[PDB]
Design a protein around this ligand. Structure first.
Ligand code: TG1
Ligand code: ALF
Ligand code: MG
Length: 994
């Protein structure tokens, strides 16, 4: 029964047809269970050991490489016996890496916890229902509960289902709805309808929600909805499925691979319309099976030259290193691809409670009565330092530390805060911090008493355990708490009946201590306390009191104000009915106003500066909280999201106000407003979605269960170290430091990493560009196989795989955080940069094929085969009366292939120096700055010698150890690749933009 909150208790019972006293008949339970199902949250486990492997062979850059891998296995069988020394080497390596990289993508994806499983921890095992089966309450499985069931909940119990409250047995029902609102403050419930059908969870005060727990009291109700039809079920539903998309860099890679799949097929066709003028004369040298060998061996060698293999290993290497760095920075990363993204962040959606604030209620302002003289009334206002529950702070009178014992009004004020209090303070010796025991708004009073110390008790010598309730203990030694009249909705206050320590059972020195809402309490005050004296409550006095209440309860302050009063002449204990709470307000009449305490959940000390750093980095921060709009806007002004005098009429909406807006204006409000309050879990994820509709990478940070739907939907989910398990599992990153400043440092790392990532991406891609131009020449110009795909797999993975990672340690810019966020749709290769790598690509491709022809044309230790008689590389064994030369094995010699590969390696080592910077000369930008790059080139050149020395290495690669003769020509062809790119750099920074 949806919208049961808008209906009466009678209408809800009539909806399911069930008596409140008897409950559902066993037949009704049968029919309802078949209709609504079991009260369960369906578990999810899509990530298996099998499906993850299947996912690996789905990528476009993999299927092409896999397709070429299959072919390679076929074209390796067709081989003679003169060169069978290398039988199946190519099909092995091409499949080895395809598994070596696919086994990595699984190891960094299956290791993830289940947010839903953590969410189901809020599902109670059992539940108490009232069936027609028997009069006594049955304790059944919480899953066997059906809509319409009569359910009883008690204090400490975890709510089993979404319930429309029928009757409250206790005086009040206090409920902790932190999983839906993010606020652990006890919510007072009732059994009256909530007319608004569009009401949010914070408005449904007649509803009990599954997962939430009864903080205090006992009540009966009827089940509205079960399973995923519940509010916690909504949270569950928004955390399933492909929840997360692809990294903006991976989108660029997929864009590259998409065009690559179309151009590779284009080149293979291109080398077909040119090879026509030759079929006019046949040749009994080879049929279709022998004439197609050169057409498919170049089709698979083209993909190897194009696809930048080894890059997933380089990226993974670069990401793993950054994670270790940020872990020292106190940021724990759960998702590697999110590191990259974090940098491109433009908007940061932040939770308020627990994230921006300390989640510890603190009395920051309080005032008593100074002087009352006729129509004049002055107040002694005080301010308190400290943002936690620790007894560590100072009472300030106009920014001056003054003891509270000197003020008699503060003495009795602290007395009420200690006596009229069901909560207490405790020091967790394990965590080493002070924790609360009971209501947070009450522990704030306990902490206040300790801070004040109105009796000047020597507490600097006491331990942290004793310090917790030291000053509070002393106050208990003066007045003995007889009984307490608990809180009630009609009264909006609470009181305690106290008696002087050690006295007769017939004296008359008892007192009462009232605490509650300013409106109700002060109205029941007929007197005013000045220190220890008492004066009657008058007009000007009451106005002066209420004025400061309104100034503290609203505006820049906006604090939860509590009126504190005492009844100096309490009624006789014999004439007071304690079993009836309706008479408690009468007992709290003719009061004496003492003072008012103002409390708040204060922001963390380092938040304001952190947000400013984000603004300087061009990153806006939007608060999305389940708390009220009053405190939300107030905090925003404190931490600098809003100006102290800035108008925010259209820059701050509630979830209710946000839903009233047309869908067009909702989307615009996300770009305008920076504060959203009193929201549901679905609202947070909806705001994130709207921001993502503007092509914006958005970060979400929180600590509660209600944050999880937005933590997942956002690009970067950020959790707090002291946050919930549900929040951590749904986040990509966790702040072990619990500081917002950690996020800023992490973004700085994210930006710095990407710039280095952006470098070797360009470097490896440009490397693969030149390789394709090389293959394009040999297939078109007529030259034999200059480079085989077996060699290229060792170049792009080892030869170029090391300087690539070495470019991951490039020195970041000093203005890395003084520059606005980069565009998500920013191409890595465009403009003049595209012309550079195209010229380099055409250079590298010509430097390899050309060097291969150097062994034939401009040679010295090789044959003098001219350009004309080299095109017919095939017609040498079948054609001699027309073509007379030397040998036929010269075309497949291990010297022109080694000559071309040596050039390729040398250029890349030089191109890596040109990849250290984009538009800066090597003179102004010293290549010896990157120490890790120098040691990488030397290591790369060391393996280039190793593969030419140790005999089992140049065998499978078909290479010959080039002497110091042909090696000198390399420094005349490969070396001047610096100047080519240098000129392009000079023009780019002089005729475009420096
Ligand atoms: C690496 C191998 C190269 C040869 C390749 O095929 O990639 C092309 C192609 C897919 C693009 C091109 C390549 O185009 C060519 O270089 C022409 C090739 C055809 C001539 C045959 C040789 C004689 C990139 C590589 O070339 C530059 C270097 O000039 C740049 C860029 O790529 C990026 O920005 C990388 C994004 C991760 C892309 O234009 C990209 O397509 C677009 O979607 C982008 C935005 O991706
Ligand atoms: F802690 Al919140 F919205 F402020 F979940
Ligand atoms: Mg929170």
């Amino acid at each position: 029964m949806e919208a049961a909150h808008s209906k009466s208790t009678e209408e809800c019972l009539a909806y399911f047809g069930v008596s409140e006293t008897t409950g559902l008949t066993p037949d009704q339970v049968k029919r309802h269970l078949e209709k609504y199902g079991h009260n369960e949250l369906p578990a999810e486990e899509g990530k298996s050991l099998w499906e993850l492997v299947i996912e690996q062979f789905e990528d476009l850059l993999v299927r092409i490489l896999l397709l070429a891998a299959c072919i390679s296995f076929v074209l390796a069988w067709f081989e003679e016996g003169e060169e069978t020394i290398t039988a199946f080497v190519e099909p092995f390596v091409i499949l080895l890496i395809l598994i070596a990289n696919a086994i990595v993508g699984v190891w960094q994806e299956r290791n993830a916890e289940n947010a839903i499983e953590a969410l189901k921890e809020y599902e109670p095992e059992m539940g108490k229902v009232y069936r027609a089966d028997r009069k006594s309450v049955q304790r059944i499985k919480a899953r066997d509960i059906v809509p319409g069931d009569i359910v009883e909940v008690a204090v400490g119990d975890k709510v089993p289902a979404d319930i429309r409250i029928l009757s409250i047995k206790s005086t009040t029902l206090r409920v902790d709805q932190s999983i839906l609102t993010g606020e652990s403050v006890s919510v007072i419930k009732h059994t009256e309808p909530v007319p608004d059908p569009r009401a949010v969870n914070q408005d449904k005060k007649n509803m009990l929600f599954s997962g939430t727990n009864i903080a205090a009291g006992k009540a009966l109700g009827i089940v509205a909805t079960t399973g995923v039809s519940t509010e916690i079920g909504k949270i569950r539903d928004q955390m399933a499925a492909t929840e997360q998309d692809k990294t903006p860099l991976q989108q660029k890679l997929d864009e590259f691979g998409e065009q690559l799949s179309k151009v590779i097929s284009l080149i293979c066709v291109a080398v077909w319309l040119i090879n026509i003028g030759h079929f006019n004369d046949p040749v009994h040298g080879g049929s279709w099976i022998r004439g197609a060998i050169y057409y498919f061996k170049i089709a698979v060698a083209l993909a190897v030259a194009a696809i930048p293999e080894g890059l997933p290993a380089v990226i993974t290497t670069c990401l793993a290193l950054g994670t270790r760095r940020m872990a020292k920075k106190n940021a724990i990363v759960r998702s590697l691809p999110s590191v990259e993204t974090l940098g491109c962040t433009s908007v940061i959606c932040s939770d308020k409670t627990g994230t921006l604030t300390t989640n510890q209620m603190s009395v920051c302002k309080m005032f008593i009565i100074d002087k009352v003289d006729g129509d004049f009334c002055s107040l002694n206002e005080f301010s308190i330092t400290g943002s936690t529950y620790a007894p560590e702070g100072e009472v300030l009178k106009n920014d001056k530390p003054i003891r509270s014992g000197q003020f008699d009004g503060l003495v009795e004020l602290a007395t009420i805060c200690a006596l009229c209090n069901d909560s207490s303070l405790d020091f967790n010796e394990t965590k080493g911090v002070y924790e609360k025991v009971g209501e947070a708004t009450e522990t704030a009073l306990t902490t206040l008493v300790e801070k004040m110390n109105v009796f000047n008790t020597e507490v600097r010598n006491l331990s942290k355990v004793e310090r917790a309730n030291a000053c509070n203990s002393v106050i208990r030694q003066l007045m003995k708490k007889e009984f307490t009249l608990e809180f009630s909705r009609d009264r909006k206050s609470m009181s305690v009946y106290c008696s002087p320590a050690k006295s007769s059972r017939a004296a008359v020195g008892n007192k009462m201590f009232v605490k509650g809402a300013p409106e109700g309490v002060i109205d029941r005050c007929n007197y005013v306390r000045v220190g220890t004296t008492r004066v009657p409550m008058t007009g000007p006095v009451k106005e002066k009191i209420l004025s400061v209440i309104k100034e503290w309860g609203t505006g820049r302050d906006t604090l939860r104000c509590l009126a504190l009063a005492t009844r100096d002449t309490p009624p006789k204990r014999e004439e007071m009915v304690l079993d009836d709470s309706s008479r408690f307000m009468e007992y709290e009449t003719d009061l004496t106003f003492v003072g008012v305490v103002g409390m708040l959940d204060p922001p963390r000390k380092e938040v304001m500066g952190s947000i400013q750093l984000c603004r300087d980095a061009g990153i806006r921060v939007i608060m999305i909280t389940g708390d009220n709009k009053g405190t939300a806007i107030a905090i925003c002004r404190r931490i600098g999201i809003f100006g102290e005098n800035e108008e925010v009429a259209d820059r701050a909406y509630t979830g209710r106000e946000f839903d009233d807006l047309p869908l067009a204006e909702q989307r615009e409000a996300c770009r305008r407003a920076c504060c959203f309050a009193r929201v549901e879990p679905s609202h947070k994820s909806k705001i994130v979605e709207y921001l993502q509709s503007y092509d914006e990478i958005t970060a979400m940070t929180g600590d509660g269960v209600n944050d999880a739907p937005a933590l997942k939907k956002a690009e970067i989910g950020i959790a707090m170290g002291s946050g919930t398990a549900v929040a951590k599992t749904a986040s990509e990153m966790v702040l072990a430091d619990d500081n917002f400043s950690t996020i800023v440092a992490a973004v700085e790392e994210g930006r710095a990493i990407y710039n280095n990532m952006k470098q070797f991406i360009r470097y490896l891609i440009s490397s693969n560009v030149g390789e394709v131009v090389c293959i394009f020449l040999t297939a078109a110009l007529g030259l034999p196989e200059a480079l085989i795909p077996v060699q290229l797999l060792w170049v792009n993975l080892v030869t170029d795989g090391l300087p690539a990672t070495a470019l991951g340690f490039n020195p970041p810019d000093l203005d890395i955080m003084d520059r606005p966020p980069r565009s998500p749709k920013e191409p890595l290769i465009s403009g003049w940069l595209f012309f550079r790598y195209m010229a380099i690509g055409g250079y590298v491709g010509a430097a390899t094929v050309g060097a291969a022809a150097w062994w034939f044309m401009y040679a010295e230790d090789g044959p003098g085969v001219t350009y004309h008689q080299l095109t017919h590389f095939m017609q040498c064994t079948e054609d001699h009366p027309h073509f007379e030369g030397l040998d036929c094995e010269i075309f497949e010699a291990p010297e022109p292939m080694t000559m071309a590969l040596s050039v390729l390696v040398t250029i890349e080592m030089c191109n890596a120096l040109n990849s250290l910077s984009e538009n800066q000369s090597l003179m102004r930008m010293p290549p010896w700055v990157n120490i890790w790059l120098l040691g990488s080139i030397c290591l790369s050149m060391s393996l280039h010698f190793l593969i030419l020395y140790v005999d089992p290495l140049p065998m499978i690669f078909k290479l010959k150890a080039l002497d110091l003769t042909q090696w000198l020509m390399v420094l005349k062809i490969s070396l001047p690749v610096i100047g080519l790119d240098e000129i392009l750099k000079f023009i780019a920074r002089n005729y475009l933009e420096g």
